[PDB]
């Protein structure tokens with residue numbers, strides 16, 4: 015397969031322009047721009063740089079003597095409509111903007127940024143996530159979820175930051191209210207896995223300590239805010255549960271449309287089991303949460319807390335206000351739900367559900383730590399692409415007939431985890447896979463190398479069958495008119 | 507096996523369940539807990555240790571309380587009212603506070619400097635405190651409180667107390683007349699067992715020393731008072747007799763509507779025999795007093811004392827004034843009963859019957875000290891769950907067919923008494939059972955773990971039987987043809 019293996023660096027993040035298909039790659043001291051065929055369109059160096067976590071940028075040796083040279087693994091890498099957003103691990107995680115298609119060309123780098131323009135975690139271990147969307151002021155906003163770091167200030171775990179503000183020197187700053195107001199950051203230890211949009215709703219997947227549970231164990235959550243408000247009124251926090259927390263550490267996730275799973279888009283999540291913040295080598299599972307059910311529970315958490323003091327019509331306590339913020343649920347008129355579906359400066363917030371969103375595992379893999387999810391539907395049925403901590407990429411048919419073991423496994427790079435940033439190309443014919451030292455372009459389905467029916471059906475791959483009338487080892491859509499290679503009792 | 511809650515380094519005093527939400531509030535040593543209907547911890551509040559002497563008045567500051575010690579705070583009173591949770595501790599003269607139903611952490615009202623008229627619960631952890639939430643004439647929240655004697659002082663045994671006066675800082679106080687005026691509190695030695703309401707009436711269950719008897723012995727009594735009446739004019743005590751005082755000491759009770767026992771509500775009360783103060787380790791009985799017969803005798807006791815100087819038509823003192831109070835039965839015109847059925851500032855008070863309200867044991871178990879009662883009617887016939895002093899929960903069928911021995915018994919916690927806060931859930935599907943160190947959620951029936959008819963019928967449980975259609979071990983409702991597992995002569 016086609017590869018990109020830059021020497022002298024490690025790969026942190028992969029961002030694909032959905033309009034152009036250009037790939038941008040965020041590595042240690044390098045950004046890359048790649049053709050959709052992994053041809054190198056451009057290269058930008060970003061480090062090492064003189065830095066100390068105690069000094070504030072711009073880091074000069076005069077007012078930062080403790081400075082030492084410091085490598086710069088990539089923290090945020092995002093395709094905004096206007097530009098490419100790049101945030102690093104160095105200089106308190108400040109960000110810059112580069113020309114989409116001309117990585118080499120820098121659009122904007124605040125010259126002397128403030129305590130409010132430190133964006134990413136300035137620790138490459140800690141993890142930063144991000145989403146871009148159009149704001150009500152006309153210009154595009156950048157949501158950022160941010161793990162905890164022990165330096166500078168205490169940055170909020172989620173923030174909504176301006177990318178194209180009036181003064182461009184203020185870009186990446188957030189209005190005083192554009193944040194989740196969370197104290198005790200060190201205690202919650204937010205660990206972000208992913209952020210995504212759909213409809214008017216932004217979603218964040220993350221881990222955080224349950225401070226009311228007896229163990230103060232970590233616990234997986236999905237929270238939803240409205241895409242458009244700079245503010246965090248609509249913020250609703252749901253706990254996630256894959257088999258009621260046997261697999262309690264969400265590792266990666268992907269959205270996809272599948273019809274036999276549920277109507278609407280569906281969130282496929284990979285949870286591991288804990289040994290304390292990380293997985294144990296321990297088992298993994300893949301759960302699916304239909305977003306229309308994510309919205310329905312989140313919707314009825316809002317509806318309870320706005321109009322029924324946090325109770326269902328059943329009478330049950332379902333909703334409350336998390337993070338010890340001074341705010342309780344209310345008995346506002348039901349007209350409120352229509353007038354202000356995303357809240358006001360005076361509605362309850364931040365809202366959380368007492369009811370967990372629960373899913374029974376689609377598959378349960380005993381020895382594996384899943385790190386990466388990619389899901390598509392082919393000729394009616396789900397096929398998952400799953401990467402693990404050991405650099406393997408598993409392909410799993412999930413339709414009828416399957417005990418859900420990988421029909422195919424493949425070693426991208428032994429002993430090095432596959433990235434959540436695992437993404438398909440535009441036609442869905444290929445999947446870009448990335449470990450820490452290589453990025454591969456992998457074909458979903460290599461059917462047509464087979465030039466005889468018996469070779470076709472021996473490939474044994476849900477994508478492949480023998481089109482009888484055309485003498486072709488093809489995919490069903492490309493047609494005894496198609497002899498599926500994934501039905502062993504059958505043959506030529 | 508049950509779902510449980512076992513908090514470390516604490517003991518459980520009371521459990522109060524919210525009849526609308528089903529959420530459970532626990533009251534413990536230095537702790538409040540809030541738990542889902544499934545016993546998941548939703549919140550925890552510390553209530554101690556505190557600085558305190560029984561000699562000081564709250565708020566205890568060291569500049570006014572030199573003798574203050576670290577003092578633990580076992581819970582004394584835990585009641586869901588309409589707006590808040592009422593909480594009263596054993597410290598700070600037993601003062602009370604209120605907290606948000608559904609967010610216990612959030613507090614609603616805690617008088618800043620309270621008076622001699624606002625020391626509510628017994629400021630000694632070994633003394634009884636019972637309470638009942640009612641509404642006054644103007645439909646505002648009231649709190650009847652019964653408390654045992656405690657060696658500042660003079661707190662009346664029963665008092666009506668305002669949960670939300672005009673002036674929030676006046677909460678939990680009581681108007682000068684809103685009290686049962688007892689002189690010799692040390693001698694009467696009220697031990698309150700329970701308070702409950704039904705109809706227009708509030709009822710209290712307690713022990714007191716009978717000082718008109720030669721024995722001066724402790725005797726079990728039930729007293730009734732009109733809910734509207736906040737001045738205790740209408741107060742009237744009936745002695746309770748379970749096999750003529752063989753079983754002297756009432757221990758726990760629970761009301762239930764049962765078809766085969768009487769019309770209306772019926773009080774199922776567990777009495778124990780006195781040790782030749784408290785129970786011997788002895789024998790217990792379960793006696794049933796229909797509330798309609800309580801009201802009848804209390805009504806005849808009122809009538810006989812208003813209009814016939816306490817005598818019946820044949821001429822016998824059947825009613826008299828108790829508690830060496832200066833008041834006598836009168837020969838008031840008969841129309842006084844219609845004009846003043848709950849008494850006056852000028853009518854006889856407080857009233858007692860000379861005639862005991864009598865009942866004969868539903869069951870008598872020698873060698874068991876019963877401590878907790880819950881009764882339900884299942885398919886027309888009474889079932890009683892009874893806890894005891896050794897943390898054992900006995901299940902008893904009382905329909906036709908039994909010598910009244912338990913068809914099932916479990917250890918909740920060996921040798922630690924089951925609390926009289928034994929209480930069903932909302933579907934009467936489960937039972938919340940608590941000893942001093944654990945809380946359990948017990949299903950009433952474990953029918954369906956049964957696969958074959960043999961096994962089903964071998965459970966020998968009045969709840970379980972074999973639905974012959976459907977082919978599963980169900981309950982008579984979830985069928986209609988059904989083979990009862992509590993009829994041994996019947997097989998399949």
Ligand SMILES: *[C@@H]1O[C@H](CO)[C@@H](O)[C@H](O)[C@H]1NC(C)=O
Pocket residue numbers: 306307309310313351355
């Ligand atoms: C959630 O609520 C929004 C607005 O209040 C509505 O547009 C949407 O249909 C709801 N989604 C559900 C009920 O799944």
Ligand SMILES: *[C@@H]1O[C@H](CO)[C@@H](O)[C@H](O)[C@H]1NC(C)=O
Pocket residue numbers: 798801802805843847
């Ligand atoms: C007791 O008396 C009241 C009024 O005096 C009456 O309404 C009630 O029904 C009576 N209860 C009885 C007789 O059981």
